[PDB]
Design a protein around this ligand. Sequence first.
Ligand SMILES: Nc1nc(=O)n([C@H]2C[C@H](O)[C@@H](COP(=O)(O)OP(=O)(O)OP(=O)(O)O)O2)cc1C=O
Ligand SMILES: [Ca+2]
Ligand SMILES: [Ca+2]
Ligand SMILES: [Cl-]
Ligand code: NA
Ligand code: NA
Length: 325
Amino acid sequence: TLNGGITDMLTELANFEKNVSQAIHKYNAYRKAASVIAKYPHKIKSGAEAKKLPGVGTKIAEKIDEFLATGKLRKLEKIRQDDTSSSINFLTRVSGIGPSAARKFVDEGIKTLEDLRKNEDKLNHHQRIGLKYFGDFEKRIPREEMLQMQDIVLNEVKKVDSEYIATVCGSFRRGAESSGDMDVLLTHPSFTSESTKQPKLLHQVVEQLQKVHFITDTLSKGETKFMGVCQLPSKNDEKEYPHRRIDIRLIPKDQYYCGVLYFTGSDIFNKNMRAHALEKGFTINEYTIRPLGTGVAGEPLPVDSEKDIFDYIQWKYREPKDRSE
DNA sequence: CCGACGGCGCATCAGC
DNA sequence: GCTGATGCGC
DNA sequence: GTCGG
Ligand SMILES: Nc1nc(=O)n([C@H]2C[C@H](O)[C@@H](COP(=O)(O)OP(=O)(O)OP(=O)(O)O)O2)cc1C=O
Ligand SMILES: [Ca+2]
Ligand SMILES: [Ca+2]
Ligand SMILES: [Cl-]
Ligand code: NA
Ligand code: NA
């Protein structure tokens, strides 16, 4: 963690711009700079040494100069003191409360955790579940627990239909020792880019996972994305495991590699790769890679591997463990 | 200097 | 009810 | 906030 101070500071500036300012491009800009600094294999000794990185320009260079000299950033010392900025930042930590709803609660005087618990009737369903598990969701999942969650998920899916393949992606597939939550990619041969030969393909799996008391709450559910809550079984006289966020994404079976690339991330890796893809005249989503001609997407190029996606844009292959940008 | 910034699923809302 | 925009999430 | 054209 050679430049942890700097990247914490940038992440905190990024969170401010997203949550308070509602400036999503400064948020991405700060997070890109944070990202490029975190992989820099030297202890940064000045801002001008940092401005040499792509994504670090003049404003951030000055902030890194200030931070190296004093150990803090007055722009951030002030944000920390503004009670309104601090209240809005706190409320966005509840899942389903975003920058707009956070600023709306503050106008009403709902600014603290006790205020939300007294005003549950002002929360939609997602927000209510986010409040319900606010502290559990703050906790990280050790890989050992993700391994048990994987075993349960894969075994329960095989009981529904042995032709399902479920793949755990996200930071787990990149090899992190701990994860924010669980992300499961789901395929079945009945669902392709050409046909849906069976309805309820995601519902049945969700239903089955609810039946064994693994999934405990539904934040949102449609025909290809589930977002909810799960929890490992505990033993006799044992404290319960914290409840965990789980996302299941059903993806057409012939689009697996584009989906698994998407769902392995990281989010910033996906941003840099899809940005670079544009520069090479392609567009990438979780289904296909397509050429650009007028700037309009052409037809899906053939993809047989994650590597074929990298090839098209003239990137050497990067294993999942080296995509934690 | 300036346009452009990755791409999309689900929930909710306005307007018809 | 649908359609498109907005909010919030991955 | 940053950057390539
Ligand atoms: N904006 C995003 N764009 C993306 O393409 N994604 C893709 C890439 C991610 O890896 C994956 C899962 O999302 P998650 O939020 O779970 O990220 P993880 O990488 O798994 O990190 P932890 O769970 O905190 O360990 O979805 C996520 C975004 C979220 O902000
Ligand atoms: Ca995750
Ligand atoms: Ca997730
Ligand atoms: Cl597509
Ligand atoms: Na730079
Ligand atoms: Na939130």
